[PDB]
Design an enzyme around this catalytic site. Structure first.
Site, PDB file in Angstrom:
ATOM      1  N   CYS A  46      40.740  27.959  41.564  1.00 17.44           N
ATOM      2  CA  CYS A  46      39.903  29.057  42.065  1.00 17.44           C
ATOM      3  C   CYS A  46      38.685  29.168  41.153  1.00 17.44           C
ATOM      4  CB  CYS A  46      40.683  30.359  42.155  1.00 17.44           C
ATOM      5  SG  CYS A  46      39.759  31.821  42.575  1.00 17.44           S
ATOM      6  N   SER A  48      37.535  31.757  39.995  1.00 11.42           N
ATOM      7  CA  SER A  48      37.858  32.741  38.948  1.00 11.42           C
ATOM      8  C   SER A  48      38.446  32.091  37.706  1.00 11.42           C
ATOM      9  CB  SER A  48      38.768  33.811  39.441  1.00 11.42           C
ATOM     10  OG  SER A  48      38.206  34.459  40.575  1.00 11.42           O
ATOM     11  N   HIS A  51      35.568  30.943  35.857  1.00  6.75           N
ATOM     12  CA  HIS A  51      34.913  32.095  35.184  1.00  6.75           C
ATOM     13  C   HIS A  51      35.503  32.321  33.788  1.00  6.75           C
ATOM     14  CE1 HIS A  51      32.632  32.900  38.712  1.00  6.75           C
ATOM     15  NE2 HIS A  51      33.376  33.887  39.228  1.00  6.75           N
ATOM     16  N   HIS A  67      46.113  31.117  38.535  1.00  8.00           N
ATOM     17  CA  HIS A  67      46.680  32.303  39.226  1.00  8.00           C
ATOM     18  C   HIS A  67      46.993  32.093  40.697  1.00  8.00           C
ATOM     19  CE1 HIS A  67      42.360  32.447  39.935  1.00  8.00           C
ATOM     20  NE2 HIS A  67      42.588  33.208  41.019  1.00  8.00           N
ATOM     21  N   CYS A 174      45.826  33.293  46.272  1.00  6.95           N
ATOM     22  CA  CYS A 174      44.526  33.901  45.943  1.00  6.95           C
ATOM     23  C   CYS A 174      43.541  33.682  47.086  1.00  6.95           C
ATOM     24  CB  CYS A 174      43.945  33.437  44.604  1.00  6.95           C
ATOM     25  SG  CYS A 174      42.403  34.329  44.369  1.00  6.95           S
TER      26      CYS A 174
HETATM   27  N1  LIG Z   1      37.993  39.710  44.805  1.00 11.87           N
HETATM   28  C1  LIG Z   1      38.971  38.831  44.580  1.00 11.87           C
HETATM   29  O1  LIG Z   1      40.167  39.163  44.566  1.00 11.87           O
HETATM   30  C2  LIG Z   1      38.607  37.416  44.351  1.00 11.87           C
HETATM   31  C3  LIG Z   1      39.539  36.386  44.657  1.00 11.87           C
HETATM   32  C4  LIG Z   1      39.167  35.071  44.596  1.00 11.87           C
HETATM   33  C5  LIG Z   1      37.887  34.726  44.234  1.00 11.87           C
HETATM   34  N2  LIG Z   1      37.008  35.713  43.816  1.00 11.87           N
HETATM   35  C6  LIG Z   1      35.633  35.408  43.458  1.00 11.87           C
HETATM   36  O2  LIG Z   1      34.973  35.021  44.677  1.00 11.87           O
HETATM   37  C7  LIG Z   1      33.910  34.128  44.352  1.00 11.87           C
HETATM   38  C8  LIG Z   1      33.998  32.859  45.207  1.00 11.87           C
HETATM   39  O3  LIG Z   1      35.151  32.116  44.791  1.00 11.87           O
HETATM   40  P1  LIG Z   1      35.342  30.630  45.378  1.00 11.87           P
HETATM   41  O4  LIG Z   1      35.181  30.641  46.845  1.00 11.87           O
HETATM   42  O5  LIG Z   1      36.588  30.101  44.753  1.00 11.87           O
HETATM   43  O6  LIG Z   1      34.062  29.941  44.696  1.00 11.87           O
HETATM   44  P2  LIG Z   1      33.194  28.665  45.034  1.00 11.87           P
HETATM   45  O7  LIG Z   1      34.048  27.637  45.673  1.00 11.87           O
HETATM   46  O8  LIG Z   1      32.442  28.325  43.775  1.00 11.87           O
HETATM   47  O9  LIG Z   1      32.151  29.123  46.127  1.00 11.87           O
HETATM   48  C9  LIG Z   1      30.940  29.838  45.851  1.00 11.87           C
HETATM   49  C10 LIG Z   1      29.877  29.380  46.817  1.00 11.87           C
HETATM   50  O10 LIG Z   1      28.716  30.166  46.504  1.00 11.87           O
HETATM   51  C11 LIG Z   1      27.599  29.343  46.694  1.00 11.87           C
HETATM   52  N3  LIG Z   1      26.461  29.922  45.986  1.00 11.87           N
HETATM   53  C12 LIG Z   1      26.206  29.895  44.685  1.00 11.87           C
HETATM   54  N4  LIG Z   1      25.078  30.593  44.397  1.00 11.87           N
HETATM   55  C13 LIG Z   1      24.594  31.007  45.613  1.00 11.87           C
HETATM   56  C14 LIG Z   1      23.404  31.785  46.043  1.00 11.87           C
HETATM   57  N5  LIG Z   1      22.543  32.160  45.102  1.00 11.87           N
HETATM   58  N6  LIG Z   1      23.321  31.963  47.327  1.00 11.87           N
HETATM   59  C15 LIG Z   1      24.215  31.592  48.250  1.00 11.87           C
HETATM   60  N7  LIG Z   1      25.299  30.848  47.921  1.00 11.87           N
HETATM   61  C16 LIG Z   1      25.457  30.617  46.602  1.00 11.87           C
HETATM   62  C17 LIG Z   1      28.033  27.990  46.143  1.00 11.87           C
HETATM   63  O11 LIG Z   1      27.208  26.928  46.565  1.00 11.87           O
HETATM   64  C18 LIG Z   1      29.487  27.906  46.649  1.00 11.87           C
HETATM   65  O12 LIG Z   1      29.634  27.187  47.862  1.00 11.87           O
HETATM   66  C19 LIG Z   1      33.997  33.900  42.833  1.00 11.87           C
HETATM   67  O13 LIG Z   1      33.123  34.798  42.120  1.00 11.87           O
HETATM   68  C20 LIG Z   1      35.415  34.275  42.523  1.00 11.87           C
HETATM   69  O14 LIG Z   1      35.604  34.625  41.173  1.00 11.87           O
HETATM   70  C21 LIG Z   1      37.386  37.042  43.936  1.00 11.87           C
HETATM   71 ZN   LIG Z   2      41.311  33.570  42.514  1.00 10.68          ZN
END
Ligand SMILES: NC(=O)c1ccc[n+]([C@@H]2O[C@H](COP(=O)([O-])OP(=O)([O-])OC[C@H]3O[C@@H](n4cnc5c(N)[nH+]cnc54)[C@H](O)[C@@H]3O)[C@@H](O)[C@H]2O)c1
Ligand SMILES: [Zn+2]
Ligand SMILES: NC(=O)c1ccc[n+]([C@@H]2O[C@H](COP(=O)([O-])OP(=O)([O-])OC[C@H]3O[C@@H](n4cnc5c(N)[nH+]cnc54)[C@H](O)[C@@H]3O)[C@@H](O)[C@H]2O)c1
Ligand SMILES: [Zn+2]
Ligand SMILES: [Zn+2]
Ligand SMILES: [Zn+2]
Lengths: 374, 374
Positions: A46, A48, A51, A67, A174
């Site tokens: 993930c 996260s 991060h 996770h 997740c």
């Molecule tokens: N709220 C929750 O419980 C929870 C759970 C899981 C993930 N997250 C978060 O959700 C986010 C996405 O996670 P993921 O899908 O695994 O990540 P990921 O696979 O890195 O996807 C992020 C996407 O955002 C795109 N991106 C980056 N910058 C930009 C921008 N400026 N404009 C438009 N697109 C952009 C990028 O190209 C990628 O395809 C992360 O910040 C995680 O930490 C939160």
């Molecule tokens: Zn996650």
């Protein structure tokens, strides 16, 4: 036989920020009262977890991250009633104690026993079950799934169907549940609506899946990486836009495309600027915007409260709003019953030993979910 | 005797920011197609009218302000169907055109014909019906009720019960409906909940009325003016707190008082800092915060989006979320049937000619609502 004994096993330890994971031998203590030791079968990568590496998400180091996973119970501590040795399980990074005011609330899911708000990096009892080279190693979100074995509190584990394919259903730990629930439960997307999804990674694709399941008429995917667009359309996006292609700010573009703003928007990236853009592009009187992306540590956004005064709703959620222990077994049953698909999220399957290669695939833009197999 | 004729009458003209109103003769043109000329009977002094004076709420000057009022139709323009001469009416500062996407939406009330988001200070046709000293004078929110006569668009007026007491029901044109609806319609306060209301003026007292009508168990009033507390308790506050009395920030105080955060909070002041404090004091997983206060022009707040990611909902609304033309007559009928009280809001009565004294009373902290009689 391992019950009651320390296990020596392989894990991916993060000793400090901005370094590769170290794959080496750790010692995993047996479970205490109300604790569960799990043999890992599969874990997803993930953003996260990345991060933690980048220092975007602060948690005590050194740590065993991970996770999003599934495995099989190796042993249970005194007093455990909800799982038994041999059960398939998903660790719950958001616990469900069932006793706190949040757990008792019909719409709450961010249990007060969580380790996300104010991360300690321990078991509920304030101690660690991990050592490595004679040093204590922190837990992550009460899960720590980048290890052949972990120990979790009972409130941080759910029993799932014995016939579950763990290499797929680990995503219910997740990314799938978060995105799908953000759409169907938190936003409550309506039939015939227009949605905009910012970020087309594993979580954003899961948001699209939920918007399509809810009957949205239009689902606009937004990403700066146009290589993400094909899969977004396969899972339900009706059109995709790259902000870099436009002279105007993308909130103006999306407002124009939706003849005055979208019904529902989702921030699924983790940037302050896109959180404000996603709020702005939802219709000013009745639009809803949901923050899903984890923001960078201790940074505040700037916004004009007139965006809310006109009638917008802004909210966020952890884990799609799902009460974790109630929901995860039902999501697995629904997957088994073909109610939704997980394969579209899985681009790579690697042995656990290739964790760093899996993170490099995420960072390069080349994967959605890599599943690591033990 | 005046149909089709220019009317010369007295109005309160604001020539300059931060100056008294000038009570002087204006010329009021007759109504054009789909316009209504109203003989004013009563108008309240809302803090938003003061915001025009102070430059908090930017609208073109010179202007005839006033938006909380009731009167009697003097004449109708060609094609008007919804009111007739001699009808009692309330001008609607939020119009209801009935045709735009917001008016058609079940939740939406901030009709796209409003003059609040980017004020022009005109009629819907982009012109003014007011002249003073031979100079054109702007309208305010399509209402301009600080005048013996005004002209409004048909979508900005509602017919009300012929037996209405106009010196009371003028408050349904802004402050009562806004506060009451913010609780019952926008927040949807639940039975047994704990509410916190920031700002105990006419609007905040109306929020309290709505929280009590919805069955809240606890309603915590928050004001830096402790003189406001007695009336707040009369209309349903269970306790009142003055932030100036406490060493700790009031969001911490309210979180402790509510054993972990309130169910519903309301910002009813118009400050950036209290909008963030009001969000923070609602429970992090399931709390709801509603912005009601009008923020200072063009200023952004700063906040940590982790407040939303945990599960909070943040929203705002104009006019309590009520679809104005549908709702105002029903609210008047409910008042006539004693379903709510307006007298607790009315602390002073003055003739219109004493408008500046009425603003002095508001600015000193003495009044809640002053009602001016023509
Ligand atoms: N709220 C929750 O419980 C929870 C759970 C899981 C993930 N997250 C978060 O959700 C986010 C996405 O996670 P993921 O899908 O695994 O990540 P990921 O696979 O890195 O996807 C992020 C996407 O955002 C795109 N991106 C980056 N910058 C930009 C921008 N400026 N404009 C438009 N697109 C952009 C990028 O190209 C990628 O395809 C992360 O910040 C995680 O930490 C939160
Ligand atoms: Zn996650
Ligand atoms: N959203 C809408 O449609 C709408 C409608 C009507 C009024 N408003 C706004 O709502 C706000 C309240 O209007 P009103 O009730 O007529 O005003 P008011 O009578 O001036 O009441 C405001 C109250 O806030 C109190 N106050 C000032 N500063 C603080 C502080 N730092 N902490 C706590 N209390 C404080 C103050 O003492 C007073 O009792 C104003 O900003 C209006 O412009 C909005
Ligand atoms: Zn709990
Ligand atoms: Zn309209
Ligand atoms: Zn007002």
């Amino acid at each position: 036989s391992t019950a009651g004994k320390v296990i020596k096993c392989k894990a991916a330890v993060l000793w400090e920020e901005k370094k590769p994971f170290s794959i080496e031998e750790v010692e995993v203590a047996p479970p205490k009262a109300h604790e569960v030791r799990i043999k890992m079968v599969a874990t997803g990568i993930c953003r996260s977890d990345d991060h933690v590496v980048s220092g975007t998400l602060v948690t005590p180091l050194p740590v065993i991250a991970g996770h999003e996973a599934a495995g099989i119970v190796e042993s249970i501590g005194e007093g455990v009633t909800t799982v038994r040795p041999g059960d398939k399980v998903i660790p719950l990074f958001t616990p469900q104690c069932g006793k706190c005011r949040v757990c008792k609330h019909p719409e709450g899911n961010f249990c007060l026993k969580n380790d996300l708000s104010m991360p300690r990096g321990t078991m509920q009892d304030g101690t660690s079950r991990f050592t490595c080279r004679g040093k204590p190693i922190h837990h992550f979100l009460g899960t720590s799934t980048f290890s052949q074995y972990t120990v979790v509190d009972e409130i941080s584990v759910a029993k799932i169907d014995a016939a579950s394919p763990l290499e797929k259903v680990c995503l219910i730990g997740c990314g799938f549940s978060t995105g799908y629930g953000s759409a169907v439960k938190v936003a409550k997307v309506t039939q015939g609506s227009t949605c905009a999804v910012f970020g087309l990674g594993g979580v954003g694709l899961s948001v699209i899946m939920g918007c399509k399941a809810a009957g949205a008429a239009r689902i606009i995917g937004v990403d700066i990486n146009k290589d993400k667009f094909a899969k977004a359309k396969e899972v339900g996006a009706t059109e995709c836009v790259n902000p870099q292609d436009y002279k105007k700010p993308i909130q103006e573009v999306l407002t124009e495309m939706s003849n005055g703003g979208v019904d529902f928007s989702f921030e699924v990236i983790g940037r302050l600027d896109t959180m404000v853009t996603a709020l702005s592009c939802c219709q000013e009187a009745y639009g809803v915007s949901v923050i899903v992306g984890v923001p960078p540590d201790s940074q505040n956004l700037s916004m004009n409260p007139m965006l809310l005064l006109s009638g917008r709703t802004w909210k966020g959620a952890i884990f799609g709003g799902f009460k974790s222990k109630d929901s995860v077994p039902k999501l697995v049953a629904d997957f088994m019953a073909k109610k939704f698909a997980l394969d579209p999220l899985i681009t790579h399957v690697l042995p656990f030993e290739k964790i760093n290669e899996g993170f490099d695939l995420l960072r390069s833009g080349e994967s959605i979910r890599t599943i690591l197999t033990f």
